[PDB]
Design an enzyme around this catalytic site. Sequence first.
Site, PDB file in Angstrom:
ATOM      1  N   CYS A 123       0.830  -1.201   0.000  1.00 23.11           N
ATOM      2  CA  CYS A 123       0.000   0.000   0.000  1.00 23.11           C
ATOM      3  C   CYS A 123       0.866   1.253   0.000  1.00 23.11           C
ATOM      4  CB  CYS A 123      -0.921   0.025   1.224  1.00 23.11           C
ATOM      5  SG  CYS A 123      -1.905   1.540   1.267  1.00 23.11           S
ATOM      6  N   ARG A 130       0.042   4.626   2.895  1.00 19.69           N
ATOM      7  CA  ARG A 130       0.085   4.405   4.338  1.00 19.69           C
ATOM      8  C   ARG A 130       0.479   5.631   5.163  1.00 19.69           C
ATOM      9  NH1 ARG A 130       3.937  -0.601   4.793  1.00 19.69           N
ATOM     10  NH2 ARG A 130       4.381  -0.058   2.586  1.00 19.69           N
ATOM     11  N   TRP A 184      -9.080   6.599  -0.748  1.00 21.23           N
ATOM     12  CA  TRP A 184      -9.377   7.342  -1.965  1.00 21.23           C
ATOM     13  C   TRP A 184      -8.413   6.886  -3.057  1.00 21.23           C
ATOM     14  CZ3 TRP A 184      -8.245  10.093   2.611  1.00 21.23           C
ATOM     15  CH2 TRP A 184      -6.901  10.473   2.756  1.00 21.23           C
ATOM     16  N   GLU A 201      -4.646   4.115 -10.762  1.00 18.03           N
ATOM     17  CA  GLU A 201      -5.468   2.925 -10.600  1.00 18.03           C
ATOM     18  C   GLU A 201      -6.610   2.917 -11.609  1.00 18.03           C
ATOM     19  OE1 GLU A 201      -6.160   1.596  -6.335  1.00 18.03           O
ATOM     20  OE2 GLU A 201      -5.710   3.746  -6.042  1.00 18.03           O
TER      21      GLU A 201
HETATM   22  C1  HEM Z   1      -6.322   6.615   1.977  1.00 13.72           C
HETATM   23  C2  HEM Z   1      -5.838   6.563   0.726  1.00 13.72           C
HETATM   24  C3  HEM Z   1      -5.216   5.267   0.125  1.00 13.72           C
HETATM   25  C4  HEM Z   1      -4.492   5.231  -0.994  1.00 13.72           C
HETATM   26  C5  HEM Z   1      -4.122   6.433  -1.890  1.00 13.72           C
HETATM   27  C6  HEM Z   1      -4.092   3.870  -1.246  1.00 13.72           C
HETATM   28  C7  HEM Z   1      -3.327   3.446  -2.308  1.00 13.72           C
HETATM   29  C8  HEM Z   1      -3.169   2.117  -2.634  1.00 13.72           C
HETATM   30  C9  HEM Z   1      -2.835   1.624  -3.942  1.00 13.72           C
HETATM   31  C10 HEM Z   1      -2.564   2.525  -5.162  1.00 13.72           C
HETATM   32  C11 HEM Z   1      -2.790   0.297  -3.863  1.00 13.72           C
HETATM   33  C12 HEM Z   1      -2.495  -0.666  -5.014  1.00 13.72           C
HETATM   34  C13 HEM Z   1      -3.890  -1.096  -5.483  1.00 13.72           C
HETATM   35  C14 HEM Z   1      -3.826  -2.044  -6.652  1.00 13.72           C
HETATM   36  O1  HEM Z   1      -2.906  -1.868  -7.491  1.00 13.72           O
HETATM   37  O2  HEM Z   1      -4.697  -2.962  -6.738  1.00 13.72           O
HETATM   38  C15 HEM Z   1      -3.134  -0.102  -2.499  1.00 13.72           C
HETATM   39  C16 HEM Z   1      -3.171  -1.387  -2.006  1.00 13.72           C
HETATM   40  C17 HEM Z   1      -3.547  -1.746  -0.728  1.00 13.72           C
HETATM   41  N1  HEM Z   1      -4.029  -0.881   0.240  1.00 13.72           N
HETATM   42 FE1  HEM Z   1      -3.986   1.168   0.158  1.00 13.72          FE
HETATM   43  N2  HEM Z   1      -4.596   3.073  -0.237  1.00 13.72           N
HETATM   44  C18 HEM Z   1      -5.313   3.902   0.618  1.00 13.72           C
HETATM   45  C19 HEM Z   1      -6.000   3.479   1.741  1.00 13.72           C
HETATM   46  C20 HEM Z   1      -5.946   2.213   2.281  1.00 13.72           C
HETATM   47  C21 HEM Z   1      -6.634   1.786   3.481  1.00 13.72           C
HETATM   48  C22 HEM Z   1      -7.602   2.703   4.293  1.00 13.72           C
HETATM   49  C23 HEM Z   1      -6.312   0.498   3.694  1.00 13.72           C
HETATM   50  C24 HEM Z   1      -6.739  -0.459   4.836  1.00 13.72           C
HETATM   51  C25 HEM Z   1      -7.281  -0.015   5.998  1.00 13.72           C
HETATM   52  C26 HEM Z   1      -5.401   0.092   2.642  1.00 13.72           C
HETATM   53  C27 HEM Z   1      -4.839  -1.155   2.526  1.00 13.72           C
HETATM   54  C28 HEM Z   1      -4.320  -1.645   1.362  1.00 13.72           C
HETATM   55  C29 HEM Z   1      -3.959  -3.023   1.087  1.00 13.72           C
HETATM   56  C30 HEM Z   1      -4.068  -4.228   2.038  1.00 13.72           C
HETATM   57  C31 HEM Z   1      -3.488  -3.079  -0.156  1.00 13.72           C
HETATM   58  C32 HEM Z   1      -3.017  -4.371  -0.873  1.00 13.72           C
HETATM   59  C33 HEM Z   1      -4.207  -4.811  -1.718  1.00 13.72           C
HETATM   60  C34 HEM Z   1      -3.972  -6.103  -2.470  1.00 13.72           C
HETATM   61  O3  HEM Z   1      -2.989  -6.836  -2.162  1.00 13.72           O
HETATM   62  O4  HEM Z   1      -4.785  -6.391  -3.386  1.00 13.72           O
HETATM   63  N3  HEM Z   1      -5.202   1.155   1.789  1.00 13.72           N
HETATM   64  N4  HEM Z   1      -3.352   1.040  -1.783  1.00 13.72           N
HETATM   65  C1  LIG Z   2      -8.349   1.145   0.213  1.00 12.24           C
HETATM   66  C2  LIG Z   2      -7.847   1.289  -1.219  1.00 12.24           C
HETATM   67  C3  LIG Z   2      -7.393   2.508  -1.715  1.00 12.24           C
HETATM   68  C4  LIG Z   2      -6.953   2.607  -3.030  1.00 12.24           C
HETATM   69  N1  LIG Z   2      -6.510   3.781  -3.554  1.00 12.24           N
HETATM   70  N2  LIG Z   2      -6.944   1.510  -3.812  1.00 12.24           N
HETATM   71  C5  LIG Z   2      -7.357   0.323  -3.344  1.00 12.24           C
HETATM   72  C6  LIG Z   2      -7.406  -0.848  -4.284  1.00 12.24           C
HETATM   73  C7  LIG Z   2      -8.788  -0.592  -4.907  1.00 12.24           C
HETATM   74  C8  LIG Z   2      -9.152  -1.547  -6.017  1.00 12.24           C
HETATM   75  C9  LIG Z   2      -8.271  -2.556  -6.405  1.00 12.24           C
HETATM   76  C10 LIG Z   2      -8.623  -3.432  -7.437  1.00 12.24           C
HETATM   77  C11 LIG Z   2      -7.654  -4.519  -7.865  1.00 12.24           C
HETATM   78  C12 LIG Z   2      -8.366  -5.785  -8.331  1.00 12.24           C
HETATM   79  C13 LIG Z   2      -7.395  -6.929  -8.652  1.00 12.24           C
HETATM   80  C14 LIG Z   2      -7.079  -6.929 -10.150  1.00 12.24           C
HETATM   81  O1  LIG Z   2      -6.155  -7.979 -10.420  1.00 12.24           O
HETATM   82  C15 LIG Z   2      -4.910  -7.675  -9.807  1.00 12.24           C
HETATM   83  C16 LIG Z   2      -5.068  -7.693  -8.296  1.00 12.24           C
HETATM   84  N3  LIG Z   2      -6.172  -6.844  -7.820  1.00 12.24           N
HETATM   85  C17 LIG Z   2      -6.474  -7.337  -6.473  1.00 12.24           C
HETATM   86  C18 LIG Z   2      -9.855  -3.297  -8.069  1.00 12.24           C
HETATM   87  C19 LIG Z   2     -10.722  -2.283  -7.667  1.00 12.24           C
HETATM   88  F1  LIG Z   2     -11.909  -2.120  -8.260  1.00 12.24           F
HETATM   89  C20 LIG Z   2     -10.378  -1.414  -6.654  1.00 12.24           C
HETATM   90  F2  LIG Z   2     -11.260  -0.454  -6.313  1.00 12.24           F
HETATM   91  C21 LIG Z   2      -7.832   0.185  -2.048  1.00 12.24           C
END
Ligand code: HEM
Ligand SMILES: Cc1cc(N)nc(CCc2cc(CC[C@H]3COCCN3C)cc(F)c2F)c1
Lengths: 414, 416
Positions: B114, B117, B286, B291
């Site tokens: 993430c 953070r 947000w 993305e």
């Molecule tokens: C507040 C603004 C936030 C931004 C800008 C942000 C940004 C991102 C981005 C760009 C990713 C990669 C997403 C992808 O490529 O699928 C990500 C992944 C992730 N975020 Fe954040 N995030 C935010 C909030 C949060 C919050 C509130 C949580 C949990 C309480 C969180 C937990 C995670 C986790 C666990 C992943 C890994 C997801 C996965 O493995 O599929 N994020 N975040």
């Molecule tokens: C809390 C938070 C903030 C932020 N900025 N972004 C995220 C991920 C959001 C998000 C992530 C994804 C990824 C879906 C699959 C695609 O295959 C590759 C692996 N991936 C898991 C789809 C969504 F439709 C979506 F909305 C979460």
Amino acid sequence: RFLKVKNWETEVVLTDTLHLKSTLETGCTEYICMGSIMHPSPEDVATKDQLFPLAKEFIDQYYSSIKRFGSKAHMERLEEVNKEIDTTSTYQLKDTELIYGAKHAWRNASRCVGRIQWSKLQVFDARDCTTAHGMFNYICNHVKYATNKGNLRSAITIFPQRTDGKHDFRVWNSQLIRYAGYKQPDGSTLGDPANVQFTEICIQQGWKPPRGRFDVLPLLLQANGNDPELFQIPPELVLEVPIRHPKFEWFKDLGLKWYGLPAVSNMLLEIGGLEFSACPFSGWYMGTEIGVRDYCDNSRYNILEEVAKKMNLDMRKTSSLWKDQALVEINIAVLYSFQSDKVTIVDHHSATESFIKHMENEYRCRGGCPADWVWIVPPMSGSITPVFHQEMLNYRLTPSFEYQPDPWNTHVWK
Amino acid sequence: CPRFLKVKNWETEVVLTDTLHLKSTLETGCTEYICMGSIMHPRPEDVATKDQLFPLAKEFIDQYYSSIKRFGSKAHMERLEEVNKEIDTTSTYQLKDTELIYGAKHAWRNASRCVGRIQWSKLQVFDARDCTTAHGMFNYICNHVKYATNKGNLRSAITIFPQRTDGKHDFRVWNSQLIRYAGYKQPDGSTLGDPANVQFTEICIQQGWKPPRGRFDVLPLLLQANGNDPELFQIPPELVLEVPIRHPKFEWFKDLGLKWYGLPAVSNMLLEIGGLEFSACPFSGWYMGTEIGVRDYCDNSRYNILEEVAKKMNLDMRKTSSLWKDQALVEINIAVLYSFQSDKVTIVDHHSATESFIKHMENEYRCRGGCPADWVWIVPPMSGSITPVFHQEMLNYRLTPSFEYQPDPWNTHVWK
Ligand code: HEM
Ligand SMILES: Cc1cc(N)nc(CCc2cc(CC[C@H]3COCCN3C)cc(F)c2F)c1
Ligand code: HEM
Ligand SMILES: Cc1cc(N)nc(CCc2cc(CC[C@H]3COCCN3C)cc(F)c2F)c1
Ligand SMILES: C[C@H](O)[C@H](O)[C@H]1CNc2nc(N)[nH]c(=O)c2N1
Ligand SMILES: C[C@H](O)[C@H](O)[C@H]1CNc2nc(N)[nH]c(=O)c2N1
Ligand SMILES: [Zn+2]
């Protein structure tokens, strides 16, 4: 175990068995991954005891590769290598083994997206070299051969192997052709900022700097552990490309140029326990190496601001993506300029497409392909290239190219 | 393992020193001889035994009491004794509200993939452990969506449903994200809507959803309470904030008919706190612009609009080396950020987000002894090397509390 890698765009799954052959460490552990560390972990020279297993391993895979494993030639070579390590503390590769080893060091280079070409490599045996003048001659011949009037040809020149660590052959330049960098009185930097230190070592050794923006550095060559000596590559051997843009007629007025030949000269080639500390190798450029890293890294030529100016882009907030817009146009210009001058270059779309095809080939015929995603994915437009979506397994196979200390940190002068 | 590990930034020469990796508690997938850092994902009733649970709870409780500067206190020893008795008599235990909040914030803080953070301590935690039915889950989720959306001034939030017991009574959100668009496979092999969601859309249709069959149809919630068969609910459309995509320069860009939803909300992950497993824990933040602009719109297997935008831009599309794809990609991402900012919907560009992440990472090294980070996920999918994270060496390791992947519920559910 058999390990699977998946492409998340095409859903193609490949099965890796080749990783079972690796015995060198990656740096990761079960609990900590060092996949984004660039270098994970003069007396350090081999012994007869460490050397024979490494030699045996390499001879075995060579004779397995020409499908004569356990043959009489194989048996005799193993015995021959045994007696030589005994009586001399080292051994010499056959020409065939030198060529096989250098091609496989390329084939095994997990950070190289260009490996579809691995078996088309011209190998120049320079193991009879004794002096820096001899090294200069061999390097000029390499440069002329590899440049080939713009039709670039991959090549490597291999100087004598390490013996005791006190008589190393080294190219002190990190690449054969690079532009100098100068620390200015007012604090800023003229030329290439990456090379300020090396440029100053050349000045300190007698090089008269023209103090321009694109001054080709001299060669600094160390033979048999002696002090390094300076040489000017003849200018007609150094092919260069003026950078212009197909649409922006003002782009040429930036005064930008680059050289056609990428030639790494600071790595160590390991083959069968032997260490070749001087092994310059060269191919052709992927456009982003010049247009993204060389020109747009903040610590390099750093031209994004100027180009974005001439494009009249709104530069007050990052969210205008003015940097991304200027970046694309710079890389269009580089590709256009090399192509217009018939100098080999590959764009990052074609290069990564070829690497995916290469992986498919290696998994089929070899059972895998070690690959470092962090290095394979290009520095711009990552996810619109097919390697972004390709799972890769990184592991270390030998023969290999390794990093080594900078010579100026280890060499005792005279 | 060595006690101090160093990471270098190759642009600034800054070296940082990591000691927090010594606290890592689960496997990366790598070994001494192979690195699996680019691998995306390296029985129901197999639940924690009493013997497995005792140490996992102690480790978490110790960590909590250390964070509140009460380690070794009377309240610390009493909480340990209470938890140990609960595990003894009931084979499980319940977190205090303070511990739940601390645990959720730290699972975010520990999420190595993430980039967002820097915000981890500003997380609104909604305790929904009293929920018993799918209708109640729908209520909790609607409240979450409304709170987090906040009329475009988005607020990060998480809603935590009851933890796993025997594995046959799991709460699950079957949607992978709370708000997504349907995808519809056509007889001729083409797809309408979002091709990534075809499988889930088919499940919803089978469960009774009547699909409008459009390009941007918000999917219904499919909600499973206490291990029961899941039930369908339609999110009230006034709770789904959407942004029509237009371009500041190209007047024709609005004619593409593109829009996206404002709230990214992940609903398929498992939250692990002190050995307890929260299988339904939707969380939202947000968006970072890429993305939507790079992945959602320009992945070949998603909306895949590069060609159509390139055509309207009158680009040379015959050779890859014209970089027509790259040129259109930037313009699409410009449109996305411009449309969100114009409508006052929170969004962050990839330059600002990665710069904040570097500052966050350096603070964490200073105050916490490290910051686990997955470079492969942290580096944005466009313009990688002109963001500061590209040049930043990172160490990846798994700390608990954590968000974990879990099996898709349709693959494991025992239909009633
Ligand atoms: C507040 C603004 C936030 C931004 C800008 C942000 C940004 C991102 C981005 C760009 C990713 C990669 C997403 C992808 O490529 O699928 C990500 C992944 C992730 N975020 Fe954040 N995030 C935010 C909030 C949060 C919050 C509130 C949580 C949990 C309480 C969180 C937990 C995670 C986790 C666990 C992943 C890994 C997801 C996965 O493995 O599929 N994020 N975040
Ligand atoms: C809390 C938070 C903030 C932020 N900025 N972004 C995220 C991920 C959001 C998000 C992530 C994804 C990824 C879906 C699959 C695609 O295959 C590759 C692996 N991936 C898991 C789809 C969504 F439709 C979506 F909305 C979460
Ligand atoms: C023929 C065309 C070639 C292309 C297009 C190509 C492409 C690339 C690129 C883009 C990189 C990343 C470089 C960087 O970011 O610093 C790289 C790395 C590398 N290449 Fe290739 N390459 C080619 C030929 C070769 C040859 C001939 C060899 C050796 C015989 C080789 C061995 C390597 C090695 C060892 C690395 C790792 C460099 C390092 O660790 O610093 N490559 N290649
Ligand atoms: C054979 C071959 C083909 C090809 N296309 N590219 C290469 C790399 C070329 C190349 C690479 C580099 C990178 C040097 C530093 C930069 O900082 C990060 C660490 N890195 C080591 C500089 C050059 F001046 C140069 F020329 C080699
Ligand atoms: C194969 C590779 O691991 C996969 O494509 C990853 C790469 N990096 C990513 N990074 C983010 N943020 N999101 C992703 O889905 C991916 N996909
Ligand atoms: C920190 C990270 O390892 C470092 O910046 C790497 C990232 N990927 C790279 N990839 C290539 N091809 N070349 C590089 O120099 C780097 N630098
Ligand atoms: Zn690893």
